Design a protein around this ligand. Structure first.
Ligand SMILES: Nc1nc2c(ncn2[C@@H]2O[C@H](COP(=O)(O)OP(=O)(O)OP(=O)(O)O)[C@@H](O)[C@H]2O)c(=O)[nH]1
Ligand SMILES: Nc1nc2c(ncn2[C@@H]2O[C@H](COP(=O)(O)OP(=O)(O)O)[C@@H](O)[C@H]2O)c(=O)[nH]1
Ligand SMILES: [Mg+2]
Lengths: 157, 431, 434, 309
């Protein structure tokens, strides 16, 4: 199966094998056993060109794996700024909620990705979105003592 | 309780270790050639604790320099006190650990470990009365974290009756090289909780905030961060290096500071906090030193002391001052903030005064706290570790080095359990 | 003689021992190398404490033990480097790290047989050994642990001999360990049945006297030790001079200990005067005797007006006429409310040593014409045990630091057994003082 | 919750002529008076108390829970000649003289067989000792350093421990005997843990149960000052003492209903973590000698039981 092969290529960042595999009819929206698609994999592992190509050819920007993780969750978690911007440009849901009640804003804030937090806020990240323990990205910034993050999270108006 | 064997592992470990050797050599009047040139017998009274006496009245650090990366030796050797180190004490690999704990702990590190242990053995056999081991390393990388902790478990099994002490640098995204730093640090804390007696938590989050927010350094460098580290390292070892009554050795310090075996992570504090090349226009008074060393802004771990309670405190005052005024300020801090010091550990704050001030300061104070508020540093790392672990990001980088996924679950359980243990004693009452 | 052997265990024991012997040499006219001039008389009072060699050298019947060398090295190198038997200055390398369990077993076991073999060497040079005087701290790992191992071993090897203690009770002003109350309770528990009489020296009481009477801002160990050595000298003088009260070790138990477990008398010394405080008129017999009933002058912080007396001894030194002592006692009996237990005799035993009291030249204490040390067994001293028991209870309830002792071979139940013995002791003082 | 049960054995011929007097005075059926101080426990069994009466009060409910799929733990503590062997195993094949273990094993196989209609049972046994802080398999002499690991749900388990299938009460006794022959003994110099895992599969309902019964044999606390233990013996004594402290810290935390329970204090408390926590009943059986000479070591056994509460 070419679906399995495309998942491996996008993960490893093999741009050429991604092109070749798709050309032979590989499902651009194939899923592994946990529901990750080539797009979740390229977005996690920072392959910008692969993300752009998948999106240009039918990849569902808001596909969820078994845990509710969208490609945006993963790019916000890992700190890939250009990928976050490309996903948002392609209609990524800024406020997608996974199984832990996390949104991309929670993940960028936990990981200290400040530029991504600012980008997400400008695209309408919900500042009041609570995780399974009732925490917002702001509650995280204040319980952590992260003043720089607290400042950006309050700047709204 | 004479000799301490010093080990420095990885890039950070060898950077902060080098700085420690430069600072203490200047304090003891030892030049880069290993010759004594000072003007006080107090400098040499306890010189044997960190230095071996070589032939021709030379003093040589009891230091072992370790790394998997090659260019680390070159960088240390080119340094001001580079030539003071014993050449045979340099154990350096050529492959590197690629910021991976598993590479440091199981692969590249396991290939270099026995040759490090032979040098550790040569140094230990020549000791009249070995106190134990002091290791400098970071927790966020591969060598210092993975190989450093591998060395710690191997040294503990060979020397079970010696104290194991660490200066452990905690990662921060404000400083950071990678997203895998919460993995490397959590994996190392699981080792530290079990195999060290005393750990000084040197937090990069705290160092960066001091440099940026207090010292107004717009773009803090490693050299700016290390200026704070070297002040702390000098301060926390004053009692081991100069004549005194209090915490004069590693085991007396541990018996005073550690009420519960796992709760051995210390919050270091220092006053005054300065930038490199900053002119001192006045010396701080005893009341100012007391207030500042207990101030959250002066802590080397990004934790607020008011959010927890002190189990035990060691306070060191340096310079010429009144022992009566020190006594009074120390009594006042405790009595005015009494709810912040556990009532079930009476007289848990111990004070030492050392006549010799550090370089450039007429007066200084170092704080060593065992506070339940340190659970905030462990909560920060655990939260980032859990954020990454839930999504299984980069796990193959670790399991590909042999490592089982179960070791991540175990390290996560351990850190959460430590946080719960601090919380328990923070809510404990003498009813 | 009637020889007594002094044993100094750990830092406190050693440093106090240094000050005591410095003072005994001054009192008996012995030089730092053991030599004594013209007026020799074998048949000398101080022979109970000093043997005599060939060259006319008087050597203390003293042993110094520490699990670390630093303190004893100072003795081997100082003014008295040639005073003691060099084989009677014994040191290990690795100390007890403020841990009773290390002094008592894990570390102490390595040196105990050497210590007993060295004690035996001094004991063999004795024609009529009375027993031992043991100096140590309650708080240190060696002072606490090593002393109780030693006391246990001496009880087996010298069953019929008296053993006396000079125990340094902890104070937070000079304390170097958080675990000092654990070590104090464990040592008290194990030593209780092996000691016949023990003189507690509360570091806080000595510290307060140095601050209030000697005007010392921040008292050092040198300041405390010189004062303590003065008081110990006042207690031991009867053994070293040919007096009538407390002439032998057995007599301390007879006069001060009617109940075996209640063997902790209170020492009150007067007058303590600053050498820099000139010029005051000399204190009379009445003034120094009245000063014995003032809590400020006690070696231990407690209030005897709260408790009851079982025994009372007054030991004078200097220009003291017996009639003036008799008159001052009658004054005290009427004017003061000194309550004795409804079974012991309401009497004050008196001793007088006519030698002017001696001080260290250049020290903080002024040379006085007459001095007194009152030795009384009062139930009020139970307060000092209550303060220690309280600190122990606060930490033990949380098992704080217990892993250190358990890590050194101790079983946790030993903490409970020791604390029950302290509770039985507090009750013993309650039952007597009623 | 946790229950502590004290058992006094009758006096033996070796100490009858020794002229020792009975220091053991009793109150109610829960209190034992030694030297005018009382000692309250969940139940105090006198010398006259049968093996049947001892088993019913201390182990019978735990056995029912294990057969119902829940966990339970039984600890046995006592110095040498206290009565551990007699209480826990006794005359292994005799119906009256048999202790606690043959009774547990009797009751388990009496539930088994009686359910053969839709149920499929598998009885798996494990036997390990903690000696010098190492987990040694008593069923495989090659496995001398087993490690405690966690599954995906943080539950600690002993990795690679032998799991012997047992189809009869005699098979269990033979396994205990085989393991006993592998135990480090100078008087035990290690803690012993015997695991009885009762597995059941309801063929028609497709629902599975797995109840764990832990039988812990505790070596007595050693006062190392006395005995004069050195080298490996001293390392053994420290290890036994450390483990008993850890255990005391764990049961104390569970008794006070603390949010933090220090299972991480020992490898023993971590092996027993799942069976000590939550919906699990635990009994600590402490064996005492009533002799006037044993008053020291008996008051030591009594204070350990008090620590549990
Ligand atoms: N008065 C007096 N007390 C002292 C002196 N030295 C120490 N202490 C007290 O003794 C206690 C500490 O015990 P140490 O005697 O120093 O310790 P140690 O017996 O040598 O035992 P370790 O060092 O633990 O092996 C504290 O209460 C100190 O304040 C001294 O010279 N004089
Ligand atoms: N404070 C401080 N942190 C450093 C220094 N060098 C590296 N680090 C930190 O060390 C961590 C891990 O990196 P490193 O020691 O370089 O890796 P290793 O060579 O594999 O041990 C990261 O969190 C870095 O921020 C230094 O000189 N000072
Ligand atoms: Mg000492």
């Amino acid at each position: 199966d070419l679906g399995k092969k495309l998942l491996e290529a996008a993960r490893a960042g093999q741009d050429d094998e991604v092109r070749i595999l798709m050309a032979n009819g590989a499902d651009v929206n194939a899923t592994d056993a946990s529901g990750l698609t080539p797009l979740h994999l390229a977005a996690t592992y920072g392959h910008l060109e692969i993300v752009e190509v998948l999106l240009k050819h039918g990849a569902d920007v808001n596909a969820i794996d078994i845990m509710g993780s969208t490609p945006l969750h993963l790019a916000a978690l890992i700190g890939h700024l250009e990928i976050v911007e490309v996903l948002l440009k392609h209609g990524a849901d800024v406020n997608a909620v996974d199984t832990w009640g996390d949104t991309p804003l929670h993940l960028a804030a936990i990981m200290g990705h400040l530029e991504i937090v600012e980008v997400l806020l400008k695209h309408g990240a919900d500042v009041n979105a609570q995780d399974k323990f009732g925490k917002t990205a702001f509650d995280i910034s204040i319980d952590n003592g992260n003043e720089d993050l607290a400042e950006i999270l309050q700047k709204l108006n | 309780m004479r000799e301490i064997v010093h080990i420095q592992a990885g890039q950070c470990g060898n950077q902060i270790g080098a700085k420690f050797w430069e600072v203490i050599s200047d304090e003891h009047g030892i030049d880069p050639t290993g010759s004594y040139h000072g003007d006080s017998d107090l400098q040499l009274e306890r010189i044997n604790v960190y230095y071996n006496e070589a032939t021709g009245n030379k003093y040589v650090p009891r230091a072992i320099l370790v790394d998997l990366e090659p260019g680390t030796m070159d960088s240390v050797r080119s340094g001001p006190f580079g030539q003071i180190f014993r050449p045979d004490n340099f154990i350096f690999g050529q492959s590197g650990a690629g910021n991976n704990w598993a590479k440091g702990h199981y692969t590249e590190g396991a290939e270099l470990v026995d040759s490090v242990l032979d040098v550790v053995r040569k140094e230990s056999e020549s000791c009249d009365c070995l106190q134990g081991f002091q290791l400098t390393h970071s927790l966020g990388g591969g060598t210092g974290s993975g190989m450093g902790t591998l060395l710690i478990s191997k040294i503990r099994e060979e020397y079970p009756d010696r104290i194991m002490n660490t200066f452990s640098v905690m990662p921060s995204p404000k400083v950071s090289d990678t997203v895998v730093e919460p993995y490397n640090a959590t994996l190392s804390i699981h080792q530290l909780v079990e195999n060290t007696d005393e750990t000084y938590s040197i937090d990069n989050e705290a160092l960066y905030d001091i440099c940026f927010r207090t010292l107004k350094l717009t773009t803090p460098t490693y050299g700016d961060l290390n200026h704070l580290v070297s002040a702390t390292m000098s301060g926390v070892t004053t009692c081991l290096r100069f004549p005194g009554q209090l915490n004069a050795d590693l085991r007396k310090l541990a018996v005073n500071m550690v009420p519960f075996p796992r709760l051995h992570f210390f919050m270091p504090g220092f006053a005054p906090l300065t930038s490199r090349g900053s002119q001192q226009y006045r010396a701080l008074t005893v009341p100012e030193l007391t207030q500042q060393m207990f101030d959250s802004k002066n802590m080397m771990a990004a934790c607020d002391p008011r959010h927890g309670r002190y189990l035990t405190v060691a306070t060191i005052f340096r310079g010429r001052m009144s022992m009566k005024e020190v006594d009074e300020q120390m009594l006042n801090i405790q009595n005015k903030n009494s709810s912040y010091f556990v009532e079930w550990i009476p007289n848990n704050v111990k004070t030492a005064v050392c006549d010799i001030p550090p370089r450039g300061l007429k007066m200084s104070s170092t704080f060593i706290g065992n506070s339940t508020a340190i659970q905030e540093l462990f909560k920060r790392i655990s939260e980032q570790f859990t954020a990454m672990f839930r999504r299984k990001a980069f796990l193959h980088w670790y399991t590909g080095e042999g490592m089982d996924e179960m070791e991540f679950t175990e390290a996560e359980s351990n850190m959460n359990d430590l946080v719960s243990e601090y919380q328990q004693y923070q809510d404990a009452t003498a009813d | 003689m009637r020889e007594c052997i002094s044993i100094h265990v750990g830092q406190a024991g050693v440093q106090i021992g240094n000050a005591c012997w410095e003072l005994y040499c001054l009192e008996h006219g012995i030089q730092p190398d053991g030599q004594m001039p013209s007026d020799k008389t074998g048949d000398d009072s101080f022979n109970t404490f000093f043997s005599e060699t060939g060259a006319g050298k008087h050597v203390p019947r003293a042993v110094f033990v520490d699990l670390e060398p630093t303190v004893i090295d100072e003795v081997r190198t100082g003014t008295y480097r040639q005073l003691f038997h060099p084989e009677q200055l014994i040191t290990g390398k690795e100390d007890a790290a403020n841990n009773y369990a290390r002094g008592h077993y894990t570390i102490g076991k390595e040196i105990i047989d050497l210590v007993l073999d060295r004690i035996r060497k001094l004991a063999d040079q004795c024609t009529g050994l009375q027993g031992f005087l043991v100096f140590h701290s309650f708080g240190g790992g060696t002072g606490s642990g090593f002393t109780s191992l030693l006391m246990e071993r001496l009880s087996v090897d010298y069953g019929k001999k008296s053993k006396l203690e000079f125990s340094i009770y902890p104070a937070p002003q000079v304390s170097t360990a958080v675990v000092e109350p654990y070590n104090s309770i464990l040592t008290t528990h194990t030593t209780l049945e092996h000691s016949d009489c023990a003189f507690m020296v509360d570091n806080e009481a000595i510290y307060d006297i140095c601050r209030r009477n000697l005007d010392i801002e921040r008292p050092t160990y040198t300041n405390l030790n010189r004062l303590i050595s003065q008081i110990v000298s006042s207690i031991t003088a009867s053994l070293r001079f040919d007096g009538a009260l407390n002439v032998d070790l057995t007599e301390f138990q007879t006069n001060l200990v009617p109940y075996p477990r209640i063997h902790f008398p209170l020492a009150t010394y007067a007058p303590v005067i600053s050498a820099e405080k000139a010029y005051h008129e000399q204190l009379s017999v009445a003034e120094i005797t009245n000063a014995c009933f003032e809590p400020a002058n006690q070696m231990v912080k407690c209030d005897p007006r709260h408790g009851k007396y079982m025994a009372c001894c007054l030991l004078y030194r200097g220009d003291v006429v017996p009639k003036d002592v008799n008159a001052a006692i009658a004054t005290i009996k009427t004017k003061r409310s000194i309550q004795f237990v409804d079974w012991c005799p309401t009497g004050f035993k008196v001793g007088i040593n006519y030698q002017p009291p001696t001080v260290v030249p250049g020290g903080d204490l002024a040379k006085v014409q007459r001095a007194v040390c009152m030795l009384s067994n009062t139930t009020a001293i139970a307060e000092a045990w209550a303060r220690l028991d309280h600190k122990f209870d606060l930490m033990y309830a949380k098992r704080a630091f217990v892993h250190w002792y358990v890590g050194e071979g101790m079983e946790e139940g030993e903490f409970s057994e020791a604390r029950e013995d302290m509770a039985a002791l507090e009750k013993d003082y309650e039952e007597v003082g009623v | 919750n946790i229950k502590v049960m004290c058992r006094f054995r009758p006096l033996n011929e070796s100490e009858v002529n020794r002229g020792d007097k009975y220091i053991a005075k009793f109150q109610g059926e829960d209190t034992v008076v030694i030297a005018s101080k009382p000692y309250a426990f969940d139940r105090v069994f006198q010398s006259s108390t049968s093996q049947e009466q001892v088993y019913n009060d201390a182990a019978k409910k735990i056995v029912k829970d294990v057969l119902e799929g829940y966990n339970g733990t039984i600890f046995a503590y006592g110095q040498t000649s206290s009565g551990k062997t007699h209480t826990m195993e006794g005359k292994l094949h005799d119906p009256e003289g048999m202790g606690i273990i043959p009774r547990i094993v009797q009751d388990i196989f009496n539930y088994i067989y009686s359910m053969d209609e839709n149920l499929e049972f598998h009885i798996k046994v494990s036997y390990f000792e903690i000696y010098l802080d190492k987990i040694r398999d008593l069923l495989d002499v090659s496995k001398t350093n087993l490690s405690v690991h966690e599954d995906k749900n943080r539950v600690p388990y002993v990795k690679g421990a032998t799991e012997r299938f047992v189809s009869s009460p005699d098979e269990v006794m033979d396994t205990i005997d085989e393991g006993k022959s592998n135990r480090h003994v100078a008087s035990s110099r290690s803690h012993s843990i015997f695991l009885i895992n009762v597995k059941q599969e309801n063929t028609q309902t497709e629902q599975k149960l797995s109840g764990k019964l832990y039988l812990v044999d505790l070596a007595g606390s050693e006062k190392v000052s006395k005995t004069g233990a050195e080298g490996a013996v001293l390392d053994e004594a420290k290890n036994i003492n450390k483990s008993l402290s850890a255990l005391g810290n764990v049961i104390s935390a569970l008794a006070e209903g603390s949010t933090y329970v220090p299972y991480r204090d020992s490898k023993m408390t971590r092996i027993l973590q799942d069976s000590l926590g939550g919906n699990a009943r635990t009994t600590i059986v402490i064996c005492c000698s009533p002799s006037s000479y044993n008053e020291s070591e008996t008051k030591s056994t009594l204070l350990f039981g008090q620590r549990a509460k």
